[PDB]
Chain A
Amino acid sequence: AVQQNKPTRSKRGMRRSHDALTAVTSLSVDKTSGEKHLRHHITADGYYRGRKVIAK
């Protein structure tokens, strides 16, 4: 539970070698509305494969 001899800022870096946020670059474009949602999701205006699905 304790540290006896403080690790350098070197090894503090290499522990942070894998924290990097996964990119969500894979956007989609609508079939018959042309707008952009996230893939397998709905827009801000209720479109999903060219349908007013939620009408909100």
Chain B
Amino acid sequence: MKRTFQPSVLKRNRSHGFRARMATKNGRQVLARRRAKGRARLTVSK
């Protein structure tokens, strides 16, 4: 079947990327919670 995750890096980057999530203040809290919860991989990097 046409399964749901038909992936890319172009869909991925402009949605869940760094400068996307660290654009707005509501995004920024996720970057300031993934920090404080001590996650290694912040959002997506290659």
Direct contact of A and B (CB under 8 A): no
A residues near B, CB below 8 A? none
